[PDB]
């Protein structure tokens, strides 16, 4: 269970491409849309839904149709420099204020 990678090099330069990430889908049944996927850093393992991101190596699975890319990746893996660079610190604030906030609501 690996630590997550805070560098700015990825984890995973073979799936650096867009492209590279796209491929590694095939046919996706799944309730996330594989292209939003891949433009958030994820490529897939080829077991159900699970995905990783190409640079801090970061995991996830099990996809309602309810969340976000962007948002997970921001979740799970704050440390990520991929995330950092593509989204800014500020969506990634507003993301973990929300996440934290949606959890009061609860209780
Ligand atoms: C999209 C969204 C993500 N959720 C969290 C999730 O997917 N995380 C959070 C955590 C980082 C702790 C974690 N650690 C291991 C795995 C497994 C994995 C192994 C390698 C790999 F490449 C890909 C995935 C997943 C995972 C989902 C809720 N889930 C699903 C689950 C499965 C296992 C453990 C915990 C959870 C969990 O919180 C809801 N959907
Ligand atoms: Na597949
Ligand atoms: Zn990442």
Same mark, same amino acid.
């Given at each position: 269970?690996?630590?997550?990678?805070? $560098?700015?090099?990825?984890?995973?330069?073979?799936?650096?491409? @867009?492209? =590279?990430? +796209?491929? $590694?889908?095939?046919?996706?049944?799944?309730?996330?849309? %594989? *292209?939003?996927? =891949?433009? =958030?850093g994820?490529?897939?393992?080829?077991?159900?839904? !699970?995905? %990783?991101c190409?640079? /801090?190596?970061?995991?996830? $699975?099990?996809? %309602?149709?309810?969340?976000?890319?962007?948002?997970? #990746? =921001? %979740?799970?893996?704050?440390? /990520? !420099? @991929?995330?950092? *660079?593509? !989204?800014?610190?500020? @969506? +990634?604030?507003? +993301?973990?204020? $929300? #996440?934290?906030?949606?959890? /009061?609501?609860?209780?």
């Amino acid at each position: 269970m690996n630590f997550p990678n805070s $560098t700015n090099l990825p984890r995973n330069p073979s799936m650096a491409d @867009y492209e =590279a990430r +796209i491929f $590694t889908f095939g046919t996706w049944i799944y309730s996330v849309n %594989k *292209e939003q996927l =891949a433009r =958030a850093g994820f490529y897939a393992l080829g077991e159900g839904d !699970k995905v %990783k991101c190409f640079h /801090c190596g970061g995991g996830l $699975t099990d996809w %309602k149709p309810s969340e976000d890319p962007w948002e997970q #990746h =921001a %979740k799970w893996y704050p440390g /990520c !420099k @991929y995330l950092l *660079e593509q !989204k800014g610190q500020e @969506y +990634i604030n507003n +993301i973990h204020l $929300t #996440h934290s906030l949606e959890e /009061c609501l609860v209780r």
